[PDB]
């Protein structure tokens, strides 16, 4: 059965982006998905996205700018200390200069650079570049 709505959403975006689509539909649109999309949006990796309100869990249409190479989930959501964020970035990100590892922290869902300058840590959600 569906086990990670975020994994399904990020797979749909990847498979849309790889084929060249400018848009993609996502179901069922958790708020973690929303925050993840907002972190991708603030760094320019997607465009504008829409939440469709059905009365069950909603859907999302995401607009794609063609600049996403890969968005992925890390399952299970491993506990991450401050001092092993950099090994996740080394394992996942193509270069040290660009690309973001998304975490969920008690300070909120955020990228690893915002995590570094807020000095907060938590679990890993995924990555984007």
């Amino acid at each position: 059965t569906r086990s990670s709505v975020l994994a399904d959403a990020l797979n749909a975006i990847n498979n849309a982006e790889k084929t060249g689509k400018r848009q993609v539909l996502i179901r069922p649109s958790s708020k973690v998905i929303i925050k993840f999309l907002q972190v991708m949006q603030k760094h320019g990796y997607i465009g504008e996205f829409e939440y469709i309100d059905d009365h069950r869990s909603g859907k999302i249409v995401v607009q794609l700018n063609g600049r996403l190479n890969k968005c992925g989930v890390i399952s299970p959501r491993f506990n991450v200390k401050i001092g092993d964020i950099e090994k996740w970035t080394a394992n996942l990100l193509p270069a040290r200069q660009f690309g973001y590892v998304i975490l969920t922290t008690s300070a909120g869902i955020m990228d690893h650079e915002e995590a570094r300058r807020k000095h907060v840590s938590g679990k890993i959600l995924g990555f984007v570049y």
Binding site: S75, P76, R77, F78, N79
Partner: protein, 144 residues
């Protein structure tokens, strides 16, 4: 999920699966069974000593054709009989019979070398003297 479990709480399953499957490895199986100490001519040691029981001419495996000049040795610490190759042009003359010999493996961790069938040890010393020193005339066997 390509097989293996991925839950954050599946550590027991993953460590037990690894424990079960390490028995498929040769080295792990041998070490954990203690087969070198138990079932091996040298009781897990690098070298051994023995007494020459008899000189042997072993016919080498095809496509080679040669007499390989080994000795039957009875190990002092075990009493086990082994066959040891005597390496060089000659050097079987230096070995004789009832002489003590220091044996070694050959390098194939068991697994008889080259064209010599069933021979997994080589003579290194005889009568406390290196075969290399005897072969190169650097030293002599103590007659008395």
């Amino acid at each position: 999920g390509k097989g293996k479990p991925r839950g954050l709480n599946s550590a027991r399953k993953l460590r037990v699966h690894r424990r079960n499957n390490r028995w498929a490895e040769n080295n792990y199986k041998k070490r954990l069974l203690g087969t070198a100490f138990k079932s091996s001519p040298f009781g897990g040691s690098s070298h051994a000593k023995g007494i020459v029981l008899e000189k042997l001419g072993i016919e080498s495996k095809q496509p080679n054709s040669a007499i390989r000049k080994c000795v039957r040795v009875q190990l002092i610490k075990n009493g086990k009989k082994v066959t040891a190759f005597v390496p060089n042009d000659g050097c079987l003359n230096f070995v004789d019979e009832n002489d003590e010999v220091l044996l070694a493996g050959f390098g194939r961790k068991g697994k008889a070398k080259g064209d010599i069938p069933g021979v997994r040890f080589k003579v290194v010393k005889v009568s406390g003297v290196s075969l290399l020193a005897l072969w190169k005339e650097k030293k002599e066997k103590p007659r008395s």
